[PDB]
Amino acid sequence: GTLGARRGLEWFLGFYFLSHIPITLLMDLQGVLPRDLYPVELRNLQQWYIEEFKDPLLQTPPAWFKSFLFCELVFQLPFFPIAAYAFFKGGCKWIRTPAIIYSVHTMTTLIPILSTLLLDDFSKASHFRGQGPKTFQERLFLISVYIPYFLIPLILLLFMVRNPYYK
Amino acid sequence: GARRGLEWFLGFYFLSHIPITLLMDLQGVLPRDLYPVELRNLQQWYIEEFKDPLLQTPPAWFKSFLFCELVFQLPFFPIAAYAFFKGGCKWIRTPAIIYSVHTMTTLIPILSTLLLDDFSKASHFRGQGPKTFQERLFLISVYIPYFLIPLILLLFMVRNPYYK
Ligand SMILES: CC(C)CCC[C@@H](C)[C@H]1CC[C@H]2[C@@H]3CC=C4C[C@@H](O)CC[C@]4(C)[C@H]3CC[C@]12C
Numbered sequence: 001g002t003l004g005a006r007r008g009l010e011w012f013l014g015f016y017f018l019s020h021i022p023i024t025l026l027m028d029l030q031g032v033l034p035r036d037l038y039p040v041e042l043r044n045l046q047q048w049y050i051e052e053f054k055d056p057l058l059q060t061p062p063a064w065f066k067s068f069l070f071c072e073l074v075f076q077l078p079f080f081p082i083a084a085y086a087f088f089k090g091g092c093k094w095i096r097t098p099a100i101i102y103s104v105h106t107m108t109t110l111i112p113i114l115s116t117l118l119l120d121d122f123s124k125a126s127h128f129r130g131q132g133p134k135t136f137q138e139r140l141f142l143i144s145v146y147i148p149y150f151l152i153p154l155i156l157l158l159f160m161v162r163n164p165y166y167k
Numbered sequence: 168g169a170r171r172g173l174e175w176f177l178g179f180y181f182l183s184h185i186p187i188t189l190l191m192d193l194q195g196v197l198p199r200d201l202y203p204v205e206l207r208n209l210q211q212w213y214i215e216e217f218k219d220p221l222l223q224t225p226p227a228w229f230k231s232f233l234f235c236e237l238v239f240q241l242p243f244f245p246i247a248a249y250a251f252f253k254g255g256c257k258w259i260r261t262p263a264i265i266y267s268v269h270t271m272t273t274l275i276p277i278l279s280t281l282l283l284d285d286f287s288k289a290s291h292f293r294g295q296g297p298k299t300f301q302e303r304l305f306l307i308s309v310y311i312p313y314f315l316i317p318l319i320l321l322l323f324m325v326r327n328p329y330y331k
């Protein structure tokens with residue numbers, strides 16, 4: 001019938017947050033959670049992503065990146081079902097301030113991630129021991145997996161600051 | 168007035184942040200020749216006294232945060248100082264929430280590294296940084312207020328009745 005732009009974005013936000021739950025549990029937190037909570041097929045799927053996409057941070061996370069991973073588990077993950085509910089339902093003014101908090105937190109998390117992937121040395125002679133992108137194409141093929149987690153928080157932040165239906 | 172007392176404190180927090188950012192925090196991002204020799208020696212006194220391994224030669228993740236301090240945070244500092252020094256500025260709430268969560272998120276990995284990383288002959292930091300746990304507390308002593316004060320500002324904006 002009639003699907004408006006506001007309501008389409010809210011459905012999009014619901015699927016972003018519903019999809020983030022398995023992504024966080026089964027892939028992102030492989031570097032902090034014990035391996036034995038994962039079946040071998042899921043651990044080898046984890047290995048496939050790291051080999052194909054040349055990811056230097058997820059499997060063996062540095063301290064700065066490991067601190068963001070514990071924020072994902074302890075702060076972001078409980079919020080994902082609540083935000084999925086609110087944006088699927090659509091009329092929830094009580095999601096404004098928590099969504100802005102999430103959006104700023106996640107955009108700030110991803111600035112150093114994207115800068116490290118674009119600018120740092122991931123060679124054998126580095127501490128990443130060659131498990132990172134070497135070519136400019138390998139850097140941008142990996143950034144492509146992280147960039148929606150900056151941009152979609154950026155869209156959510158703009159939506160929540162200006163939408164009269166949430167203030 | 169306890170509400171006004173916090174606003175005066177927050178006002179002096181944002182005012183003092185301006186020189187702290189320009190003359191000290193951005194030594195690794197901005198060029199050496201911009202700074203006079205007396206300011207460069209003062210920066211060296213901080214680095215050596217507090218054994219700071221990040222500020223002078225910033226890693227890429229910390230450097231990205233420093234650029235956020237120059238481009239986003241520093242333009243906000245005078246506007247926030249005015250708002251809280253004057254009071255009655257409900258329009259600062261959503262900006263101050265954004266500033267606070269951004270700076271809290273910035274400080275979590277910094278504080279984590281300073282407290283949980285081995286700086287003892289780690290080729291990562293060229294033999295610099297805190298070695299004992301007391302040296303770690305001494306360094307964190309200058310970073311912790313820039314997490315706790317933003318945390319106070321967040322609760323202030325989210326819960327205080329004037330700022331919704
Ligand atoms: C005299 C020595 C010690 C310090 C020199 C300070 C210089 C480098 C400072 C003073 C004011 C600063 C500017 C203040 C505000 C902004 C807006 C921001 O969006 C980009 C950076 C920019 C444009 C800053 C660039 C650096 C700057 C020009």
Ligand SMILES: CCCCCCCC/C=C\CCCCCCCC(=O)OC[C@H](O)CO
Pocket residue numbers: 025026037038039073074075077078
């Ligand atoms: C308060 C903040 C902390 C709590 C936040 C919520 C924590 C979520 C809990 C568990 C998820 C664990 C994920 C591991 C899933 C592994 C898959 C698995 O076990 O598969 C089953 C089996 O192999 C089939 O036969």
Ligand SMILES: C1=C(c2c[nH]c3ncccc23)CCN(CCCc2ccccc2)C1
Pocket residue numbers: 023027028049058068069071072106109145146149
């Ligand atoms: C880190 C992410 C992340 C989001 N928010 C965070 N906050 C703090 C810390 C990290 C994050 C999200 C993206 N994720 C990559 C998933 C790669 C993948 C997806 C699907 C199937 C297989 C493999 C790495």
Ligand SMILES: C1=C(c2c[nH]c3ncccc23)CCN(CCCc2ccccc2)C1
Pocket residue numbers: 187191192213222232233235236270273309310313
């Ligand atoms: C980094 C800081 C910081 C605050 N916000 C940020 N956002 C993003 C990135 C960094 C920061 C503030 C503290 N500062 C140390 C000043 C030590 C000092 C102060 C005064 C005189 C001499 C020496 C290091």
